[PDB]
Amino acid sequence: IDINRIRVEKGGDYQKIAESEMARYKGLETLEELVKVDQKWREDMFKLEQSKKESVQLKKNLPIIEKQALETEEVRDKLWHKIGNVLQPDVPISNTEDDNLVLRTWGEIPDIKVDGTPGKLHHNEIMSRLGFYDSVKGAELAGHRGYFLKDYGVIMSMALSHYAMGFLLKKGYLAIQPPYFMKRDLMGKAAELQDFEETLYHIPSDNSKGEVDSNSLFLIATSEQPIAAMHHNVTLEDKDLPIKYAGISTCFRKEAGAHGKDTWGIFRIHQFEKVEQFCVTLPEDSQKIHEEMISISEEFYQSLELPYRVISIVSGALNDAASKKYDLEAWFPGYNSYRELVSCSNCTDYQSRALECRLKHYCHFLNGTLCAIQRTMCCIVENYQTPDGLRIPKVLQPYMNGVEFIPFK
Ligand SMILES: Nc1ncnc2c1ncn2[C@@H]1O[C@H](COS(=O)(=O)NC(=O)[C@@H](N)CO)[C@@H](O)[C@H]1O
Ligand SMILES: [Mg+2]
Protein backbone atom coordinates (compact mmCIF):
# COMPACT_ATOMS: atom_id res chain seq x y z
CA ILE A 1 0.00 0.00 0.00
CA ASP A 2 2.64 2.51 1.09
CA ILE A 3 4.92 1.32 -1.73
CA ASN A 4 2.59 2.68 -4.41
CA ARG A 5 1.53 5.57 -2.14
CA ILE A 6 5.19 6.67 -2.01
CA ARG A 7 4.15 9.16 -4.71
CA VAL A 8 3.95 11.59 -1.79
CA GLU A 9 7.75 11.68 -1.98
CA LYS A 10 7.59 12.50 -5.70
CA GLY A 11 4.76 14.97 -5.15
CA GLY A 12 6.82 16.62 -2.42
CA ASP A 13 9.54 17.48 -4.92
CA TYR A 14 7.01 18.94 -7.35
CA GLN A 15 5.86 21.13 -4.46
CA LYS A 16 9.36 22.51 -3.90
CA ILE A 17 9.76 23.24 -7.62
CA ALA A 18 6.36 24.97 -7.66
CA GLU A 19 7.28 27.22 -4.73
CA SER A 20 10.60 28.18 -6.34
CA GLU A 21 9.19 28.68 -9.84
CA MET A 22 6.48 30.94 -8.40
CA ALA A 23 9.14 33.01 -6.63
CA ARG A 24 10.97 33.27 -9.97
CA TYR A 25 7.74 34.70 -11.50
CA LYS A 26 7.71 31.98 -14.16
CA GLY A 27 4.04 31.13 -13.62
CA LEU A 28 4.40 27.34 -13.14
CA GLU A 29 3.62 26.73 -16.81
CA THR A 30 6.56 24.52 -17.78
CA LEU A 31 6.17 22.69 -14.45
CA GLU A 32 2.63 21.39 -15.01
CA GLU A 33 3.76 19.79 -18.28
CA LEU A 34 6.88 18.24 -16.72
CA VAL A 35 4.73 16.43 -14.14
CA LYS A 36 2.69 14.70 -16.85
CA VAL A 37 5.72 13.71 -18.94
CA ASP A 38 7.44 12.33 -15.83
CA GLN A 39 4.54 9.93 -15.25
CA LYS A 40 4.41 8.86 -18.90
CA TRP A 41 8.16 8.28 -18.64
CA ARG A 42 7.49 6.09 -15.59
CA GLU A 43 4.75 4.35 -17.59
CA ASP A 44 7.13 3.67 -20.48
CA MET A 45 9.91 2.59 -18.10
CA PHE A 46 7.66 0.04 -16.38
CA LYS A 47 6.76 -1.45 -19.77
CA LEU A 48 10.45 -1.52 -20.71
CA GLU A 49 11.00 -3.63 -17.57
CA GLN A 50 9.15 -6.50 -19.31
CA SER A 51 12.18 -8.70 -18.73
CA LYS A 52 10.65 -11.84 -20.31
CA LYS A 53 13.36 -13.86 -18.57
CA GLU A 54 11.38 -17.09 -19.05
CA SER A 55 7.12 -19.73 -27.69
CA VAL A 56 6.38 -16.02 -27.26
CA GLN A 57 7.85 -14.00 -30.14
CA LEU A 58 7.75 -10.74 -28.15
CA LYS A 59 11.27 -9.84 -29.35
CA LYS A 60 9.65 -7.32 -31.73
CA ASN A 61 7.87 -5.37 -28.97
CA LEU A 62 11.19 -4.81 -27.17
CA PRO A 63 12.68 -2.39 -29.76
CA ILE A 64 9.32 -0.59 -29.92
CA ILE A 65 9.38 0.05 -26.17
CA GLU A 66 13.01 1.20 -26.09
CA LYS A 67 12.85 3.76 -28.92
CA GLN A 68 9.47 5.09 -27.78
CA ALA A 69 10.77 5.54 -24.22
CA LEU A 70 13.79 7.47 -25.50
CA GLU A 71 11.48 9.76 -27.49
CA THR A 72 9.82 10.69 -24.19
CA GLU A 73 13.07 10.57 -22.20
CA GLU A 74 14.52 13.38 -24.32
CA VAL A 75 11.27 15.36 -24.16
CA ARG A 76 11.28 14.99 -20.37
CA ASP A 77 14.95 15.97 -20.05
CA LYS A 78 14.39 18.94 -22.37
CA LEU A 79 11.89 20.31 -19.83
CA TRP A 80 14.06 19.72 -16.76
CA HIS A 81 16.56 22.21 -18.22
CA LYS A 82 13.94 24.96 -18.60
CA ILE A 83 13.08 24.63 -14.90
CA GLY A 84 15.14 26.96 -12.73
CA ASN A 85 17.14 25.87 -9.71
CA VAL A 86 15.37 25.81 -6.35
CA LEU A 87 15.91 29.10 -4.53
CA GLN A 88 17.17 29.26 -0.96
CA PRO A 89 14.78 30.43 1.78
CA ASP A 90 16.63 33.71 2.47
CA VAL A 91 16.26 34.94 -1.13
CA PRO A 92 14.27 38.19 -1.53
CA ILE A 93 10.91 37.42 -3.15
CA SER A 94 10.35 40.22 -5.68
CA ASN A 95 10.20 40.72 -9.44
CA THR A 96 11.94 44.12 -9.54
CA GLU A 97 15.60 44.91 -8.94
CA ASP A 98 14.59 47.99 -6.94
CA ASP A 99 13.82 45.54 -4.11
CA ASN A 100 17.37 44.15 -3.97
CA LEU A 101 18.22 43.54 -0.32
CA VAL A 102 21.20 45.59 0.84
CA LEU A 103 23.15 43.39 3.25
CA ARG A 104 26.11 45.56 4.25
CA THR A 105 27.91 48.72 3.15
CA TRP A 106 31.59 49.64 3.41
CA GLY A 107 33.43 52.90 2.81
CA GLU A 108 32.42 56.55 2.81
CA ILE A 109 31.28 58.16 -0.43
CA PRO A 110 33.87 60.59 -1.92
CA ASP A 111 33.26 64.31 -2.43
CA ILE A 112 33.54 64.24 -6.23
CA LYS A 113 30.51 65.86 -7.89
CA VAL A 114 30.73 64.82 -11.54
CA ASP A 115 29.77 67.77 -13.74
CA GLY A 116 32.13 67.59 -16.74
CA THR A 117 34.95 69.68 -15.14
CA PRO A 118 38.50 68.26 -14.80
CA GLY A 119 38.05 67.97 -11.03
CA LYS A 120 35.06 65.65 -11.48
CA LEU A 121 34.58 63.72 -14.73
CA HIS A 122 33.09 60.48 -16.00
CA HIS A 123 35.34 57.46 -16.46
CA ASN A 124 35.30 57.75 -20.26
CA GLU A 125 36.21 61.45 -20.05
CA ILE A 126 39.22 60.79 -17.80
CA MET A 127 40.53 57.80 -19.74
CA SER A 128 40.14 59.55 -23.10
CA ARG A 129 42.09 62.51 -21.69
CA LEU A 130 44.81 60.10 -20.51
CA GLY A 131 45.28 58.18 -23.76
CA PHE A 132 43.93 55.02 -22.14
CA TYR A 133 41.65 53.79 -24.92
CA ASP A 134 40.70 54.53 -28.52
CA SER A 135 37.06 53.92 -29.43
CA VAL A 136 36.93 55.90 -32.70
CA LYS A 137 39.43 53.60 -34.39
CA GLY A 138 38.36 50.59 -32.31
CA ALA A 139 34.77 50.87 -33.54
CA GLU A 140 36.01 51.27 -37.11
CA LEU A 141 37.68 47.84 -36.92
CA ALA A 142 35.35 45.78 -34.69
CA GLY A 143 32.02 47.61 -34.82
CA HIS A 144 30.14 49.28 -31.99
CA ARG A 145 31.83 49.11 -28.54
CA GLY A 146 35.20 48.28 -30.13
CA TYR A 147 38.28 49.80 -28.55
CA PHE A 148 42.05 49.66 -28.20
CA LEU A 149 43.90 49.77 -24.91
CA LYS A 150 46.80 52.22 -24.89
CA ASP A 151 49.70 53.41 -22.69
CA TYR A 152 48.90 53.14 -18.95
CA GLY A 153 45.55 51.64 -19.92
CA VAL A 154 47.53 48.50 -20.74
CA ILE A 155 49.90 49.03 -17.80
CA MET A 156 47.11 49.38 -15.24
CA SER A 157 45.24 46.49 -16.87
CA MET A 158 48.31 44.26 -16.52
CA ALA A 159 49.01 45.48 -12.99
CA LEU A 160 45.42 44.91 -11.88
CA SER A 161 45.50 41.39 -13.34
CA HIS A 162 48.68 40.42 -11.48
CA TYR A 163 47.36 41.83 -8.20
CA ALA A 164 44.05 40.02 -8.76
CA MET A 165 45.55 36.62 -9.62
CA GLY A 166 48.07 36.91 -6.78
CA PHE A 167 45.23 37.84 -4.42
CA LEU A 168 43.58 34.44 -4.93
CA LEU A 169 46.80 32.40 -5.13
CA LYS A 170 47.80 33.71 -1.69
CA LYS A 171 44.50 32.26 -0.39
CA GLY A 172 45.26 28.80 -1.82
CA TYR A 173 43.40 29.14 -5.12
CA LEU A 174 44.45 27.14 -8.18
CA ALA A 175 45.41 29.29 -11.17
CA ILE A 176 43.84 28.27 -14.48
CA GLN A 177 43.51 29.77 -17.97
CA PRO A 178 40.81 28.00 -20.00
CA PRO A 179 40.07 27.73 -23.71
CA TYR A 180 38.29 30.79 -25.02
CA PHE A 181 35.75 28.83 -27.08
CA MET A 182 33.77 25.65 -26.42
CA LYS A 183 31.83 23.12 -28.47
CA ARG A 184 28.04 23.12 -28.73
CA ASP A 185 27.28 20.11 -26.53
CA LEU A 186 29.55 21.31 -23.71
CA MET A 187 28.53 24.98 -23.88
CA GLY A 188 24.86 23.97 -23.86
CA LYS A 189 25.26 22.22 -20.51
CA ALA A 190 27.14 25.17 -18.96
CA ALA A 191 25.21 28.21 -20.23
CA GLU A 192 21.54 29.14 -20.04
CA LEU A 193 19.37 29.28 -23.16
CA GLN A 194 19.29 33.09 -23.04
CA ASP A 195 23.10 33.15 -23.23
CA PHE A 196 23.02 31.80 -26.79
CA GLU A 197 20.60 34.48 -28.05
CA GLU A 198 21.95 37.46 -26.10
CA THR A 199 25.61 36.84 -25.23
CA LEU A 200 27.58 34.05 -26.93
CA TYR A 201 29.39 34.64 -30.21
CA HIS A 202 28.89 31.68 -32.56
CA ILE A 203 31.68 30.29 -34.75
CA PRO A 204 29.94 27.79 -37.06
CA SER A 205 31.77 25.17 -39.07
CA ASP A 206 32.56 25.85 -42.71
CA ASN A 207 29.94 24.88 -45.31
CA SER A 208 27.34 24.46 -42.55
CA LYS A 209 25.10 27.25 -43.94
CA GLY A 210 25.52 29.13 -40.66
CA GLU A 211 23.45 26.56 -38.76
CA VAL A 212 24.36 25.30 -35.29
CA ASP A 213 25.91 21.90 -35.94
CA SER A 214 27.67 19.67 -33.42
CA ASN A 215 31.05 21.13 -34.44
CA SER A 216 29.93 24.71 -33.77
CA LEU A 217 32.13 26.76 -31.45
CA PHE A 218 31.05 29.47 -29.00
CA LEU A 219 33.38 32.05 -27.47
CA ILE A 220 33.28 32.05 -23.68
CA ALA A 221 31.39 34.82 -21.90
CA THR A 222 33.30 34.05 -18.67
CA SER A 223 35.82 31.52 -17.42
CA GLU A 224 32.96 30.05 -15.36
CA GLN A 225 31.70 28.25 -18.47
CA PRO A 226 34.87 26.27 -19.41
CA ILE A 227 35.78 25.63 -15.76
CA ALA A 228 32.31 24.24 -15.03
CA ALA A 229 32.34 22.07 -18.17
CA MET A 230 35.86 20.98 -17.17
CA HIS A 231 34.29 18.60 -14.61
CA HIS A 232 32.25 16.75 -17.25
CA ASN A 233 31.88 13.07 -16.28
CA VAL A 234 34.24 13.56 -13.34
CA THR A 235 33.78 11.88 -9.95
CA LEU A 236 35.26 13.48 -6.83
CA GLU A 237 35.59 12.19 -3.27
CA ASP A 238 35.15 14.05 0.01
CA LYS A 239 38.94 14.00 0.50
CA ASP A 240 39.62 15.59 -2.90
CA LEU A 241 37.46 18.70 -2.44
CA PRO A 242 36.86 21.62 -1.72
CA ILE A 243 38.60 22.89 -4.86
CA LYS A 244 39.10 26.64 -5.34
CA TYR A 245 39.96 27.79 -8.87
CA ALA A 246 41.54 31.14 -9.76
CA GLY A 247 40.40 31.61 -13.35
CA ILE A 248 41.69 34.29 -15.73
CA SER A 249 40.60 34.79 -19.34
CA THR A 250 39.25 37.22 -21.89
CA CYS A 251 35.44 37.34 -22.07
CA PHE A 252 33.35 37.76 -25.22
CA ARG A 253 29.76 39.00 -24.92
CA LYS A 254 27.41 40.22 -27.64
CA GLU A 255 25.42 42.46 -25.24
CA ALA A 256 22.46 42.11 -27.61
CA GLY A 257 20.00 43.02 -24.85
CA ALA A 258 22.02 46.04 -23.67
CA HIS A 259 21.51 48.00 -26.90
CA GLY A 260 22.43 51.64 -26.36
CA LYS A 261 23.03 51.16 -22.63
CA ASP A 262 26.53 52.19 -21.45
CA THR A 263 28.31 52.73 -24.77
CA TRP A 264 30.91 55.35 -23.76
CA GLY A 265 34.30 54.14 -22.59
CA ILE A 266 35.01 50.60 -21.45
CA PHE A 267 32.24 50.05 -18.90
CA ARG A 268 30.22 47.67 -21.11
CA ILE A 269 32.13 46.11 -24.01
CA HIS A 270 32.20 42.97 -26.14
CA GLN A 271 35.71 41.95 -25.05
CA PHE A 272 37.20 42.23 -21.55
CA GLU A 273 39.39 40.40 -19.04
CA LYS A 274 38.21 39.03 -15.71
CA VAL A 275 39.79 37.17 -12.79
CA GLU A 276 37.23 34.65 -11.56
CA GLN A 277 36.50 32.55 -8.49
CA PHE A 278 35.18 29.05 -9.14
CA CYS A 279 34.73 26.56 -6.31
CA VAL A 280 33.64 22.93 -6.09
CA THR A 281 32.35 22.00 -2.64
CA LEU A 282 30.30 19.40 -0.82
CA PRO A 283 26.57 20.11 -0.60
CA GLU A 284 27.16 20.65 3.12
CA ASP A 285 29.92 23.23 2.56
CA SER A 286 28.16 25.15 -0.23
CA GLN A 287 26.67 27.95 1.89
CA LYS A 288 29.81 28.39 4.01
CA ILE A 289 32.00 28.70 0.90
CA HIS A 290 29.54 31.11 -0.73
CA GLU A 291 29.96 33.58 2.13
CA GLU A 292 33.74 33.06 1.95
CA MET A 293 33.86 33.86 -1.78
CA ILE A 294 31.95 37.12 -1.35
CA SER A 295 34.09 38.21 1.61
CA ILE A 296 37.22 37.60 -0.48
CA SER A 297 35.78 39.92 -3.13
CA GLU A 298 34.91 42.46 -0.42
CA GLU A 299 38.49 42.30 0.87
CA PHE A 300 39.90 42.83 -2.63
CA TYR A 301 38.00 46.08 -3.20
CA GLN A 302 38.70 47.31 0.33
CA SER A 303 42.41 47.24 -0.57
CA LEU A 304 41.58 49.32 -3.65
CA GLU A 305 39.84 51.75 -1.23
CA LEU A 306 36.74 51.74 -3.45
CA PRO A 307 33.50 52.21 -1.48
CA TYR A 308 30.89 49.58 -2.24
CA ARG A 309 27.78 47.79 -0.99
CA VAL A 310 26.88 44.09 -1.04
CA ILE A 311 23.30 43.31 -2.08
CA SER A 312 21.23 40.16 -2.54
CA ILE A 313 19.49 39.87 -5.91
CA VAL A 314 15.71 39.37 -5.92
CA SER A 315 14.13 36.08 -6.97
CA GLY A 316 12.54 37.14 -10.26
CA ALA A 317 15.87 38.41 -11.64
CA LEU A 318 18.13 35.40 -11.01
CA ASN A 319 19.48 33.09 -13.68
CA ASP A 320 18.19 29.52 -13.88
CA ALA A 321 21.35 28.16 -12.23
CA ALA A 322 21.55 30.47 -9.21
CA SER A 323 19.90 29.43 -5.96
CA LYS A 324 21.13 32.73 -4.47
CA LYS A 325 23.29 35.52 -5.87
CA TYR A 326 25.26 38.30 -4.16
CA ASP A 327 26.22 41.47 -6.03
CA LEU A 328 29.00 43.88 -5.08
CA GLU A 329 28.10 47.35 -6.38
CA ALA A 330 30.99 49.80 -6.10
CA TRP A 331 30.58 53.57 -5.97
CA PHE A 332 30.84 55.48 -9.25
CA PRO A 333 30.97 59.27 -8.70
CA GLY A 334 30.13 59.78 -12.38
CA TYR A 335 26.83 57.90 -12.33
CA ASN A 336 26.29 59.13 -8.73
CA SER A 337 25.28 55.57 -7.84
CA TYR A 338 26.53 52.10 -7.04
CA ARG A 339 27.22 49.99 -10.12
CA GLU A 340 27.69 46.24 -10.42
CA LEU A 341 31.31 45.04 -10.30
CA VAL A 342 31.05 41.49 -8.89
CA SER A 343 28.45 38.72 -9.12
CA CYS A 344 28.72 35.72 -6.78
CA SER A 345 26.24 32.86 -7.13
CA ASN A 346 25.60 29.54 -5.39
CA CYS A 347 24.49 27.25 -8.22
CA THR A 348 24.42 24.07 -6.03
CA ASP A 349 24.12 21.00 -8.32
CA TYR A 350 22.36 22.71 -11.25
CA GLN A 351 25.26 22.58 -13.72
CA SER A 352 26.99 19.63 -12.04
CA ARG A 353 23.95 17.41 -12.62
CA ALA A 354 23.85 18.62 -16.22
CA LEU A 355 27.59 17.92 -16.53
CA GLU A 356 27.46 14.67 -14.48
CA CYS A 357 29.99 15.74 -11.84
CA ARG A 358 29.14 12.96 -9.40
CA LEU A 359 30.32 12.71 -5.80
CA LYS A 360 22.71 9.86 -6.90
CA HIS A 361 24.48 12.85 -5.33
CA TYR A 362 26.42 15.63 -7.05
CA CYS A 363 28.86 18.37 -6.11
CA HIS A 364 27.88 22.02 -5.67
CA PHE A 365 29.32 24.61 -8.05
CA LEU A 366 29.87 28.23 -7.05
CA ASN A 367 31.25 31.15 -9.03
CA GLY A 368 32.12 34.73 -8.20
CA THR A 369 33.85 37.67 -9.81
CA LEU A 370 37.07 38.88 -8.24
CA CYS A 371 37.95 41.66 -10.69
CA ALA A 372 36.59 42.51 -14.12
CA ILE A 373 39.64 44.46 -15.23
CA GLN A 374 38.10 46.91 -17.70
CA ARG A 375 35.13 47.88 -15.53
CA THR A 376 37.12 48.01 -12.28
CA MET A 377 39.46 50.46 -14.02
CA CYS A 378 36.46 52.71 -14.67
CA CYS A 379 35.72 52.66 -10.94
CA ILE A 380 39.37 53.26 -9.98
CA VAL A 381 39.55 56.16 -12.43
CA GLU A 382 36.45 57.97 -11.16
CA ASN A 383 37.48 57.74 -7.49
CA TYR A 384 41.23 58.42 -7.74
CA GLN A 385 40.76 61.36 -10.12
CA THR A 386 42.09 64.86 -9.48
CA PRO A 387 41.68 68.06 -11.52
CA ASP A 388 45.31 67.54 -12.61
CA GLY A 389 45.27 63.84 -13.51
CA LEU A 390 44.76 60.37 -12.04
CA ARG A 391 46.04 58.90 -8.79
CA ILE A 392 47.12 55.25 -8.72
CA PRO A 393 45.97 53.00 -5.83
CA LYS A 394 48.77 52.18 -3.41
CA VAL A 395 48.33 48.42 -3.87
CA LEU A 396 48.91 48.80 -7.63
CA GLN A 397 51.95 51.10 -7.46
CA PRO A 398 54.49 48.24 -7.01
CA TYR A 399 53.08 46.46 -10.07
CA MET A 400 53.47 49.65 -12.17
CA ASN A 401 57.22 50.20 -11.55
CA GLY A 402 56.44 52.74 -8.82
CA VAL A 403 54.32 55.38 -10.60
CA GLU A 404 52.16 57.42 -8.21
CA PHE A 405 50.38 59.87 -10.54
CA ILE A 406 49.51 60.28 -14.22
CA PRO A 407 49.01 63.76 -15.74
CA PHE A 408 46.52 64.64 -18.45
CA LYS A 409 48.06 64.45 -21.93
N1 LIG B 1 29.89 43.66 -21.21
C2 LIG B 1 30.70 43.79 -20.16
N3 LIG B 1 31.71 44.69 -20.24
C4 LIG B 1 32.52 44.84 -19.19
N5 LIG B 1 32.47 44.22 -18.01
C6 LIG B 1 31.47 43.34 -17.96
C7 LIG B 1 30.55 43.07 -18.97
N8 LIG B 1 29.65 42.09 -18.56
C9 LIG B 1 30.03 41.81 -17.34
N10 LIG B 1 31.12 42.52 -16.90
C11 LIG B 1 31.76 42.46 -15.58
O12 LIG B 1 31.92 41.10 -15.21
C13 LIG B 1 31.24 40.85 -13.95
C14 LIG B 1 30.69 39.45 -13.94
O15 LIG B 1 29.74 39.26 -14.97
S16 LIG B 1 28.47 38.34 -14.65
O17 LIG B 1 28.11 37.75 -15.88
O18 LIG B 1 27.56 39.18 -13.94
N19 LIG B 1 29.00 37.14 -13.74
C20 LIG B 1 29.85 36.07 -14.13
O21 LIG B 1 30.25 36.02 -15.29
C22 LIG B 1 30.23 35.02 -13.08
N23 LIG B 1 31.01 34.00 -13.78
C24 LIG B 1 30.97 35.70 -11.93
O25 LIG B 1 32.12 36.38 -12.40
C26 LIG B 1 30.20 41.96 -13.87
O27 LIG B 1 29.75 42.20 -12.55
C28 LIG B 1 30.93 43.15 -14.49
O29 LIG B 1 31.82 43.73 -13.55
MG1 LIG C 1 25.40 39.95 -12.40
Which residue from 130, 135, 165, 167 is spatially nearest to 148, judged by alpha carbons?
A: 135
CA of 163 to the centre of ligand 1 (A): 18
Find the DSSP H helices in 246-372.
286-303, 350-355
Domains of the chain in start order, with CATH, are 1-84 (no CATH), 85-409 (3.30.930.10)
> Strands, DSSP E only, in 221-282?
243-252, 271-281
- 33 in a labelled binding site: no
Residue from 293, 338, 375 to probe ligand 1 pocket by mutation (most atoms less than 8 Å from CB) = 375
Q: Is the sign of the CA dihedral 349, 164, 390, 269 positive or negative?
A: negative
Tell me, in Å, the resolution of the deposited structure.
3.0
Shortest-distance Cα residue to atom 3 of ligand 1:
268
* Residue 77, helix vs strand vs coil: helix
Shortest-distance Cα residue to atom 23 of ligand 1:
224
Cβ neighbours of residue 381 under 8 Å, at least 6 residues apart?
Answer: 123, 126, 127, 132, 390
Shortest-distance Cα residue to atom 10 of ligand 1:
372
Residue 298, CA distances (Å) to 35, 301, 342, 379 in order: 42, 6, 9, 15
- 171 in a labelled binding site: no
Residue 138 to residue 134: CA distance in whole angstroms: 6
Residue 351 beta carbon below 6 angstroms from any ligand 1 atom? no
> In b/e form, how buried is each residue of 218-244, taking b as 16+ CB within 10 angstroms?
bbbbbbbbbbbbbbeeeebeeeebbeb
Q: Which own/partner contact pairs does 322-325 have at CB distance under 8 Å and 24+ positions apart? A: 322/85, 322/346, 322/347, 323/85, 323/86, 323/87, 323/88, 323/91, 323/347, 323/348, 323/350, 324/87, 324/88, 324/90, 324/91, 324/290
- 343 in a labelled binding site: yes
Residue 399 CB neighbour total at 10 angstroms: 18
364-372 and 337-348 as β-strands: parallel, antiparallel, unpaired? antiparallel
Omega within 30 of 0 (cis) for the link into 242: yes
Residue 369 beta carbon below 6 angstroms from any ligand 1 atom? yes
- Closest ligand 1 atom to 268 CA: 3
Cβ neighbours of residue 213 under 8 Å, at least 6 residues apart?
Answer: 184, 204, 205
243-252 and 174-176 as β-strands: parallel, antiparallel, unpaired? parallel
